Amino acid sequence: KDPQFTNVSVHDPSIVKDGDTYYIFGSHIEAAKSKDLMNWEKFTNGYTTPNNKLYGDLSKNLAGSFKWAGENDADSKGGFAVWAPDVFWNKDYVNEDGTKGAYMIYYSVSSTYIRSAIGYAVSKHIEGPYKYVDTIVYSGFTKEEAYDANSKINKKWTNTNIPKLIEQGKLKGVRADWFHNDGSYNNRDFPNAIDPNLFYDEKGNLWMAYGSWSGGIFVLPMDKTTGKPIYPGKDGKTPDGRLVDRYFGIKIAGGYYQSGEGTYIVYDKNTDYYYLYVTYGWLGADGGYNMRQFRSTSPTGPYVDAKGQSAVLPGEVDNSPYGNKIMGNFLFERKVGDPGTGIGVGYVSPGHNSVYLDRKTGQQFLVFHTRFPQSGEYHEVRVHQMFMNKNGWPVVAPYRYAGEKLEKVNKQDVVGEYQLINHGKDYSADIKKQIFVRLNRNNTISGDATGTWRKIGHNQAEITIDGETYDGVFVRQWDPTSKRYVMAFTALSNEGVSIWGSKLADKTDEEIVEDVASDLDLGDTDHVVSNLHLPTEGTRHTVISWTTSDAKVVSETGVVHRPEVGSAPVTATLTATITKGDATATKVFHITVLPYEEAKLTAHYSFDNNDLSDSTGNFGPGTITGNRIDNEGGTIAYADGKIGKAAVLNGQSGIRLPDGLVSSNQYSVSLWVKPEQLTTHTTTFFGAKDPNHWISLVPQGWDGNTMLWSGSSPWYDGRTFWKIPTGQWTHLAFSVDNGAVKVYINGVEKFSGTNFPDVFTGANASFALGVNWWDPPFKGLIDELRIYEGALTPSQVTDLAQT
Ligand SMILES: [Ca+2]
Ligand SMILES: [Ca+2]
């Protein structure tokens, strides 16, 4: 269990080493340091200012760049957007006192998807404070006077550095093609000016690559004395056809609006290649963020991948085929019986990397952020070691770095059963999972795949599966799931596809089948009220076969049938027969399924007496609001309803119900509605402990359909995929039983879900009909608001809907 980690959240990390300490510098002015690439310590204060750790008075220091983007403008309204910086010691930088040597930080500011710039600051010491020097590349400028929403920044090109560059003779003049006909920024072909990367070339010259979606990635030579670009000064094309622009530089990747950002280029003197890393997709859990790799013999390109395809796209096309996909979404999924606990180690949207290539030892490290399965938008930094393969491509270790190095590996330490992940070319929210194969002593591969393998020398790995040869290495890795150092491989084929392998411990089929049986647990089976998940597989393709002693209670697949209200609970046995090879084992679970129980009526605001009272007598009456839950001023009239009279909601008014109307996590709500008009997010039934802890029944939700909705800790989308009509009556109802939530329309279940939050227990919530804190009030009639203790039975709901 030896290795220990200490994690930090630094989005878009840029690695740099100062003495023997590693530093990472990310977006949102976050930075952290480590002595070992495993245990990190943050030393920054985010966007705090003044007293900003990295910038001091942030607003004053960087005002130069902030006049164009990234401070309290458009998308940065209310705050700041200082993104994706790069840091490196420039030994030739002439400081303002004439001394030589500074740490330079090139940063992005951005106010929309397109209006951005890159600027830089310098410090003699890596922990700052860094001091502004200049803003050097701008994007999102226009032909004429123009303004984005929530901004009064004149986006005209004359507000950039372009006039002064022209005055210095560094540019002929404005380039017509930077603009569409309407005068707007041509980001089909030219870049978003963010995500800079500074690298030295074979000859010790300095380049900056940058870009993000839009027209793609560009690169510019840079003066080592001052940090300023040495702008091309004229447009042209590279011999192989790539755009050269007088100002933006030389396009080396992307194009035509497609994804691709977080560029990092490394010169490798052992191989004499320039390696180009770039991240595709969107950074969110759902965005399929994935790292790609190309190479060039020249810093200025052409960069190509293992199939010789260009990094620069031929057009507005899917960028999937292009670049070696070195990491996407994956999971070494723990199956029933595996050691450890949890779902296993996997990543979601890993990306925006930097790289540290140690000069002495050739050791190489991919540094990046990632999200995780079942943790939403939470992100931490990861470090994965890389190793040059025999075709001149660094290959990425499957697990995060844990002190390991390349070694002499004996054949006996390799032969065995493996988990195998193939990263493919495709990317999406989907997550890749392991297959199970074996590398056999006779140099074949068997199991889920077939083919061959060899080890050359100490550790080169060659693996050929179905005619594809992947080359890479064998290396020992820390597997945190099993808590062992295990043998592993990583290898890349000539499609630019990476496979990763983790060696499973040797176990007999008897031992595996025993492990599966021990780990197999169905939770509470004495109080069953909804279907059971019954896994049909355990580790290494163990088969779990289920039989029931009585399908009336519960099927072979865990489908339950609750007895009617009034009937006894029914019991049944489920038997798991667990097999692998010729070994078998048995585990019995005794299942008690509970009958339905009727929800009890606890409040009835019927409006039948032309008033706001509760007919059950349990609650005080409703009172009248204005256009919000917490204001007054409105009116309620009473018109002819679906049942008796009904409340008329004019569009400026609502009803405030008593606090605590629901005070539990087992409850239901039922009501009738006749909307005269539809407005988005507008509530009918609304209950809230506060503006970040509420539930709402919404006729036209964010997806344009009726939903049950909760926010903001956590969000929950109870989606129905059913549009409500205006000018007609619709019954709506929902139940919440300790996590289980269901939503009915006109008697029919249209959403069923789990994990639903308990908003109404831990303090008395406010409640209302037709109004909340933000949205247009409901316009129409509402009728028969009924509240319950407990979840309504299906038939109870059909009853209610049945008028
Ligand atoms: Ca970067
Ligand atoms: Ca009524």
Torsion on CA atoms 317, 319, 322, 328, rounded to nearest 10: -160
**Domain that includes residue 572, residue range:** 505-598
CA of 523 to the centre of ligand 1 (A): 46
Strand (E) positions, 337-379?
A: 344-357, 364-371
Q: In this structure, are 572 and 470 located in the same domain?
A: no
- Measured over the CA atoms of residue 200, residue 368, residue 329 and residue 416, the dihedral's sign is positive
Tokens of 701: 């939700």
Q: How far apart are CA 249 and CA 235, in angstroms?
A: 9
Residue 420 in tokens: 């195998």
Quick check: 771 and 628 in contact, CB under 8 A? yes
Name the token pair of 311. 């990094």
State the amino acid at position 535 in one-letter form: P
Q: Is 608 annotated as a binding residue?
A: yes
Residue type for position 302: P
**How far does residue 613's CA lie from ligand 2's centre (Å)?**
11
Closest to 302 (Cα-Cα) out of 292, 289, 311, 291? 311
Ligand 2 centroid to Cα of residue 723, in Å, is 24
Distance 277 CA to ligand 1 centre (A): 10
* Ligand in closest contact with the CA of 353: 1
- Whichever domain contains 451, its CATH number is 2.40.128.10
The answer on 538 and 394 residing in a single domain is no
Q: Any residues with CB less than 8 A from the CB of 130 and at least 6 apart, and which?
A: 54, 55, 61, 103, 105, 121, 122, 123
β-pair type (273-280, 243-245)? unpaired
Q: Are residues 48 and 169 in the same domain?
A: yes
Q: Is residue 352 part of an annotated ligand binding site?
A: yes
41 catalytically annotated: no
Last residue of one domain, picked from the residues 479, 504, 529: 504
- What does the alpha-carbon distance between residue 713 and residue 624 come to, in Å, rounded to a whole number? 29
User: Measured in angstroms, how far is the CA atom of residue 700 from the centroid of ligand 2?
Assistant: 23
Identified catalytic residue from 73, 75, 195, 261? 261
3-state class (DSSP) for residue 449: coil
Q: How far apart are CA 226 and CA 242, in angstroms?
A: 28
Contacts of 524 (CB under 8 A, 6+ apart): none
Which three-class secondary structure state does DSSP give residue 515? helix
Q: Which helix (H) or strand (E) holds 511?
A: helix 509-519
To the question of whether residue 423 is assigned a binding role by annotation, the answer is no
| The pair of three-digit structure tokens given for residue 233, joined into one six-digit string | 């000064």
- Distance, in Å, from the CA atom of 381 to the CA atom of 363, rounded to the nearest integer, reads 19
Tokens of 598: 């009727």
Among 573, 598, 623, which residue terminates a domain? 598
CA-based nearest residue to 3, from 377, 590, 399: 399
Give the C-alpha separation, 751 to 699, whole Å: 14
Cα 355 to Cα 23, 28, 211, 554: the distances in Å are 12, 20, 18, 54
Q: Which ligand is nearest to the CA of 211?
A: 1
Is the omega angle on the peptide bond into residue 50 within 30 degrees of 0, that is, cis?
yes
Cα–Cα distance list, 431 to 167, 224, 368, 665 (Å)? 53, 43, 18, 33
Q: Could you tell me the two tokens for 361?
A: 């030892």
- What type of residue sits at position 570? V
Q: How far apart are CA 682 and CA 649, in angstroms?
A: 12
Residues 444 and 561 in one domain: no
Verify that 413 and 354 share a domain, yes or no: no
Q: Residue 185: what residue type?
A: Y
Q: Name the closest ligand to CA 86.
A: 1
CA of 706 to the centre of ligand 2 (A): 22
Residue type, 330: F
N- to C-terminal Cα distance for the chain?
65
Q: Give the up-direction half-sphere exposure of residue 469: CA atoms within 13 A in the CB hemisphere.
A: 9
- 66 and 204 together in one domain: yes
> Do residues 191 and 272 share a domain?
yes
Query: Which residues, at least 6 apart from 106, have a Cβ–Cβ distance to it below 8 Å?
Result: 85, 86, 87, 118, 119, 120, 196, 198, 208
Ion ligand 1 neighbours (CB, 5 A) are 84
Residue 622 and residue 524 share a domain: no
Distance separating alpha carbons of residues 452 and 444, to the nearest angstrom? 4
Question: Is residue 606 a known part of a binding site?
Answer: yes
Nearest ligand to the C-alpha of residue 195?
A: 1
496 and 628 part of one domain: no
The CATH number given to whatever domain includes residue 58 is 2.115.10.20
763: CB partners within 8 A, 6+ apart: 689
Q: Could you tell me the two tokens for 623?
A: 């009172």
- Give the C-alpha distances (Å, rounded to integers) separating 614 from 218, 428, 605, 623: 68, 51, 5, 12
Q: How far apart, in whole angstroms, are the C-alpha atoms of residue 227 and residue 591?
A: 72
Q: How far apart are CA 413 and CA 268, in angstroms?
A: 31
Annotated ligand binding at 404? The verdict is: no
- In contact, 330 and 351? CB cutoff 8 Å: no
393 and 418 together in one domain: no
- Catalytic-labelled residue, pool 12, 305, 338, 479: 12
Nearest to 517 by CA among 545, 549, 559, 556: 545
Maximum separation of any 2 CA atoms in the chain, in Å: 91
User: Distance between CA atoms of 36 and 38, rounded to whole angstroms?
Assistant: 5
Q: Alpha carbon 307 to chain centroid distance?
A: 29
DSSP letters along 252-300, please? EEB-TT---EEEEEEEETTTTEEEEEEEESBSSTTSB-EEEEEEESSTT
693 Cα–ligand 2 center, Å:
30
Strand segments (E) across 379-513: 380-388, 394-396, 416-422, 432-433, 435-439, 444-447, 451-456, 460-465, 468-479, 484-493, 498-503
Ligand of minimum distance to the alpha carbon of 611: 2
Let me know if 261 is a catalytic residue: yes
CB 585 within 8 A of CB 513: yes
Do 105 and 241 share a domain, yes or no?
A: yes
Asked if 342 contacts 3 with a C-beta cutoff of 8 angstroms, the reply is no
Closest by CA to 492, choosing from 270, 323, 261, is 323
The whole-angstrom separation of Cα 488 and Cα 476 is 6
> Rounded to an integer, what distance in angstroms lies between the CA atom of residue 362 and that of residue 359?
6
Q: Is 783 annotated as a binding residue?
A: yes
Describe the chain by its helix, strand, coil percentages, rounded to 5: 5, 45, 50
> In this structure, are residues 335 and 537 in contact, taking their beta carbons and an 8 Å threshold?
yes
Q: What is the count of structural domains for the chain?
A: 4
Would you say 180 and 194 are in contact if contact means Cβ atoms under 8 Å apart?
Answer: no
Place of tokens 């017509």: 176
User: Rounded to the nearest 10 degrees, how much is the dihedral formed by the CA atoms of 619, 624, 628, 631?
Assistant: -100
Q: Assess whether 307 and 432 both reside in one domain.
A: no
Backbone φ and ψ for 177, nearest 5 degrees, come out as: -70, -10
CB-CB neighbours of 505 under 10 Å: 12
> By C-alpha distance, which of 697, 695, 715 is closest to 706?
697
Resolution in A: 2.4
Task: Give the ligand with the smallest distance to the CA of 643.
Answer: 2
Q: What's the CA-to-centroid distance between 409 and ligand 1, angstroms?
A: 35
CA 785 to centroid of ligand 2, rounded, Å: 8
CA distances from 798 to 702, 731, 793 (A): 27, 10, 9
Single-letter amino acid code for the residue at 95: N
Give the other-Cβ count within 10 Å of 614's Cβ: 20
Q: Which of 446, 477, 504 is the last residue of a domain?
A: 504
**By the 8 A CB rule, do 451 and 445 touch?**
yes
d(CA 642, CA 319): 56
- For residue 670, give the H/E element and its range: strand 666-675
Strand order in the sheet with 30-34: 14-18, 21-26, 30-34, 41-42
- Ligand 1 centroid to residue 354 C-alpha, Å: 6
